[PDB]
Amino acid sequence: AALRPLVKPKIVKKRTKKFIRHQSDRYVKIKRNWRKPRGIDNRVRRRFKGQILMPNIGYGSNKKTKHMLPSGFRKFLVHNVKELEVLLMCNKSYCAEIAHNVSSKNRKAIVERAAQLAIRVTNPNARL
Amino acid sequence: SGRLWCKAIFAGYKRGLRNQREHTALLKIEGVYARDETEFYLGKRCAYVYKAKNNTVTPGGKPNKTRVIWGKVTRAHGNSGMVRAKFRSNLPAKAIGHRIRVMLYPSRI
Amino acid sequence: KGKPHCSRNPVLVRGIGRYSRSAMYSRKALYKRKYAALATVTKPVGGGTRVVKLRKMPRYYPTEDVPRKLLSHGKKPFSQHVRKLRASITPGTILIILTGRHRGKRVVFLKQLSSGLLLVTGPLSLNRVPLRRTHQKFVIATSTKIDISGVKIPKHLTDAYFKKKKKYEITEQRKVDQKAVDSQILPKIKAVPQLQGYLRSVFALTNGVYPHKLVF
Amino acid sequence: KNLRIMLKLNPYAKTMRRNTILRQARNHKLRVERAAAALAAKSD
Amino acid sequence: SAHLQWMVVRNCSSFLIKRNKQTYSTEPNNLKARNSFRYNGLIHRKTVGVEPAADGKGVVVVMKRRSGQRKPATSYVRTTINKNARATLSSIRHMIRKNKYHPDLRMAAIRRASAILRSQKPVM
Amino acid sequence: RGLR
Amino acid sequence: NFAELKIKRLRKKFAQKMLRKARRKLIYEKAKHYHKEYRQMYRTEIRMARMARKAGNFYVPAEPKLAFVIRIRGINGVSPKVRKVLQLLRLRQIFNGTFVKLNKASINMLRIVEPYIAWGYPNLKSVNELIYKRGYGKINKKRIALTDNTLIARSLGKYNIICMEDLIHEIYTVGKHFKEANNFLWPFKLSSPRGGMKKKTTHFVEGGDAGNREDQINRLIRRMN
RNA sequence: GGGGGGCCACGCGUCCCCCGCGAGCGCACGGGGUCGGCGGCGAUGUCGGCUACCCACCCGACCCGUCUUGAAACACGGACC
RNA sequence: CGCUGGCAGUCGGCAGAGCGAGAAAGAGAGUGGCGCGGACGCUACGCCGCGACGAGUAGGAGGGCCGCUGCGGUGAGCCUUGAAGCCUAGGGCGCGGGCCCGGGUGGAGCCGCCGCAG
Ligand SMILES: [Mg+2]
Ligand SMILES: [Mg+2]
Ligand SMILES: [Mg+2]
Ligand SMILES: [Mg+2]
Ligand SMILES: [Mg+2]
Ligand SMILES: [Mg+2]
Ligand SMILES: [Mg+2]
Ligand SMILES: [Mg+2]
Ligand SMILES: [Mg+2]
Ligand SMILES: [Mg+2]
Ligand SMILES: [Mg+2]
Ligand SMILES: [Mg+2]
Ligand SMILES: [Mg+2]
Ligand SMILES: [Mg+2]
Ligand SMILES: [Mg+2]
């Protein structure tokens, strides 16, 4: 009884690993978040063989399947019941995520309205 | 009642000297050592058969420890009976020097 | 109201006729063949008479649709595809089944069905292989033949006869065509010496045996 | 390699491919009877 | 004009939501609820709105009359359609096509009216 | 007008 | 009323259909005559050689008016004078090919770009293979594939070049509008030579590749095309 | 110019030099793939999860910043947060 | 990046559904011999179509629905039926900067959009 999308094309991702920062492994002060190396002798920005890769524009996802969940839907953040009548006409391509700061009492009412509006919820059993 | 596959050795990957390409495997089928004798094996189906810890479902049988990476001979390699094969997942490098099967059922005769 | 006629030129190669445009005009003789120039229904009731609508308008529309697709031309369904069959597989030959539960068994080829699959019964008194289809890719065709030209295969043995329905139990129809084919196959393979024993054996590879060195 | 694309760009290719089939068949039919008359010349 | 006030409301309206790489509108008469010039429910002289009824069943169809444009109290006429799923789909289509009332919104109105009737069904 |  | 409008639009559609059929017949009989011209040009050179050998003299054929030029090295470390000539020959990439008509002003440029190219005298079948398989037109400064004769006829139709056969004729026999017909063609984006090069760095008469291979450019054309 | 095979040649009625609409019906090397084709397994041990936890193997792989013509440097700064 | 390309023609019973085609220009006007029907679109700062191209230190420019803090507006925004913060072998999105959900911890405030300021 899952809610199917309009179409479900095959999602092609050119890379599934993260782009980790250079030398984020030898230090705890160096976080995993990407910083482009700009040193004069840096072996990573000079693109030496066998090193950490750099986030070029060529890794960009296909525009038909960009920002699309593995269920085939795209995502919209929802805070209250009123934001679902926004999504009822975009029903077969966009789904709802109830926001984290929404209480369980209102979160029950949101998924109750989404069930009759046939809108898919990515977290319907979230808090209870 | 008997063996229905040809013996092959996973010799290594398709490579240069300082670069290797893991999506193509080099295969050494037993008994063929020249390019004029390897057109029989072109297009045949390859099988890396191995065993693991967890049980997996077997088509037409009870679950067991055995699982296989399937593949296919694509072209001849070299000048001495080696062939190239492509597999659906790239072969693990612990299988270098190990037996894989070349089936006969993609048959042209 | 004309009787349909065949193509008046033979196929020289595919896509090219043997006779040209003017020669074909002459063969067809167009020189004396010149020419020049719901929805509703009425139904009664017991007041008036109703124009009842066929194919009424839909009661529901989805929020989004998919558009129509562009038109291709060479793409036919599987029931209209041409059936290729390699030259080594002629009726009466001996095959080796490679992929079923009948692995390595020597069997007798009868005919190719409409789906392209091969109708095979290597006889059940020898092989325990019934009247059963197999695919021609997964078959080794041995160069060992018998004369089979006087064997009357029943006409109901078709693709729908061997398609699965849904424990599977043998039926008496499949049991009596099994006897009917085998009663006229078995004296033709019992004439050639050692052929029934060759059929009862199972093909296998041993040490030093390479399939590209041996001929079949 | 595509015949009807070739005829779309060049309609005379239909006759230039009907010939070099017809005359090749006729020359093949001539050489086989010539070779069969040689086999009769070495039989008589 | 409609274009003139669209150039004001296209980016700094209070009905506009821009998140998750999408844009919408919470406008009362915006059927399909998206931010565009064609579907905007307040800049045009002739607007069509399709909403659920106040009680459980029925579909309310709202039009905007041509006379009172600066008079929003009596501007919108409202009708309630508590019928079967097919005659309402013929009725709204008639109200748009035969009256020639903003004719490029007819299938959007039918698609909204079908969704309201589907939402008013018992859930499974 | 040649074919009528 | 519309009964006159429908038949008027039908007569317009019919006139468009007859104008197309007359053009197709024109293309067919143009190619049929080009066949006869190629047969005459092939048989005449054999005849003129035989009739000289009968009298005991020698027949000297005319030097060919057409050449095919292929750039056979990369873009790294190139002299500036040679870069300018390689750009005026439209050979901006390795394994690019172009048709060049031959005169003194062309031979003195091919001598300048001699170690970086491999040029020669193309066959008629070589021109057929090159224009049919790799033929792309420069239309509105865009590389457009020659998939229909209208694409040629829309740009080169003022020079009476209206199909593939007219284009191949004006390339093979270097005609009046050879400059326009050759500049309409995009430079030929050819693959690497199958089988392999002999030696890229040396001249053809030194057992290499560079320079003028006179009759042997076709052997490179089949393995590179 | 005179007295067996392929032709994108097949009108009638003149003057004259050279002696503007036929309908239908299907097939397809024709403006980028479809099947109107199928088979196996699936409720307490199995199916899918590329990414993320650990481990194994093959190939690659010198520590960053900086000055410098030139840094992995037996050039300087740097234990870690 | 270029074509300083295309689309306001969604022109519907006040209807007639087109501008790819080798050849400057009008599917122009007049004057005489049953069945009530037809997908999507167009945030024009939007959408769509053809080609060609893609190294980079010093440096320059553009785009950030990348990020932090505060202010004017705005979400009939979120919140003791649990905010900020923190932890996480959990599920994901984005080339990336980063972000959204799930679990736990915690006990009182916090965020999205349009602009402004550092
Ligand atoms: Mg440096
Ligand atoms: Mg075992
Ligand atoms: Mg160099
Ligand atoms: Mg080779
Ligand atoms: Mg050199
Ligand atoms: Mg190593
Ligand atoms: Mg320094
Ligand atoms: Mg120094
Ligand atoms: Mg420097
Ligand atoms: Mg350094
Ligand atoms: Mg040192
Ligand atoms: Mg110092
Ligand atoms: Mg120190
Ligand atoms: Mg760059
Ligand atoms: Mg951690």
From Swiss-Prot, chain A:
Subcellular location, principal: cytoplasm
GO BP annotations, alphabetical order: translation
Classification via InterPro entries: Ribosomal_eL32 (IPR001515), Ribosomal_eL32_CS (IPR018263), Ribosomal_eL32_sf (IPR036351)
Record-level Gene Ontology MF annotations: structural constituent of ribosome
UniProt keywords, alphabetically: Cytoplasm, Isopeptide bond, Phosphoprotein, Ribonucleoprotein, Ribosomal protein, Ubl conjugation
Modified residues (N6-succinyllysine): K49
Residue(s) of cross-link: Glycyl lysine isopeptide (Lys-Gly) (interchain with G-Cter in SUMO2): K8
Subcellular location(s) of the protein: Cytoplasm
Recorded family membership: Belongs to the eukaryotic ribosomal protein eL32 family.
Protein name as catalogued: Large ribosomal subunit protein eL32
Native organism: Oryctolagus cuniculus
The encoding gene: RPL32
From Swiss-Prot, chain C:
The keyword Phosphoprotein belongs to this UniProt entry's keyword annotation: yes
Keywords from the named record: Acetylation, Cytoplasm, Endoplasmic reticulum, Isopeptide bond, Phosphoprotein, Ribonucleoprotein, Ribosomal protein, Ubl conjugation
CDD domains: KOW_RPL6
UniProt record, GO biological process: cytoplasmic translation; ribosomal large subunit assembly
Cellular component terms (Gene Ontology): cytosolic large ribosomal subunit; rough endoplasmic reticulum
Pfam family, one: Ribosomal_L6e
Residues annotated with N6-acetyllysine modification: K167
Record-annotated membrane-spanning stretches: none
GO molecular function, one term: RNA binding
Subcellular location: Cytoplasm, Cytosol; Cytoplasm; Rough endoplasmic reticulum
Assigned protein family: Belongs to the eukaryotic ribosomal protein eL6 family.
Role played: Component of the large ribosomal subunit. The ribosome is a large ribonucleoprotein complex responsible for the synthesis of proteins in the cell.
Known partners and oligomeric status: Component of the large ribosomal subunit. May bind IPO9 with low affinity.
Protein name: Large ribosomal subunit protein eL6
The organism of origin for this protein: Oryctolagus cuniculus (Rabbit)
Lineage: Eukaryota, Metazoa, Chordata, Craniata, Vertebrata
From Swiss-Prot, chain E:
Sequence positions bearing Phosphoserine: S114
Gene3D superfamilies for this protein: 3.30.390.110
Keyword S-adenosyl-L-methionine attached: no
Keyword line: Acetylation, Cytoplasm, Isopeptide bond, Phosphoprotein, Ribonucleoprotein, Ribosomal protein, Ubl conjugation
Residue ranges that the Swiss-Prot or TrEMBL entry lists as coiled coil: none
Modified residues (N-acetylserine): S1
GO biological process: translation
Gene Ontology cellular-component terms listed: cytoplasm; ribonucleoprotein complex; ribosome
Primary location: cytoplasm
Example of a GO MF term: structural constituent of ribosome
UniProt cross-link Glycyl lysine isopeptide (Lys-Gly) (interchain with G-Cter in SUMO2), position: K57, K64
Pfam family name, one: Ribosomal_L28e
Subcellular location(s) per record: Cytoplasm
Family to which the UniProt record says this protein belongs: Belongs to the eukaryotic ribosomal protein eL28 family.
Quaternary assembly: Component of the large ribosomal subunit.
Role description: Component of the large ribosomal subunit. The ribosome is a large ribonucleoprotein complex responsible for the synthesis of proteins in the cell.
Protein name per UniProt: Large ribosomal subunit protein eL28
The species this protein was found in: Oryctolagus cuniculus
Gene name of this polypeptide: RPL28
UniProtKB/Swiss-Prot annotation, chain F:
Domain of life where this protein originates: Eukaryota
Chain's role: Component of the large ribosomal subunit. The ribosome is a large ribonucleoprotein complex responsible for the synthesis of proteins in the cell.
Record text on subunit structure and interactions: Component of the large ribosomal subunit.
Compartments where located: Cytoplasm
Protein name: Large ribosomal subunit protein eL29
Family membership noted in the UniProt record: Belongs to the eukaryotic ribosomal protein eL29 family.
Species per Swiss-Prot/TrEMBL record: Oryctolagus cuniculus
Parent-protein residues present: 114 to 117 of 245
Gene: RPL29
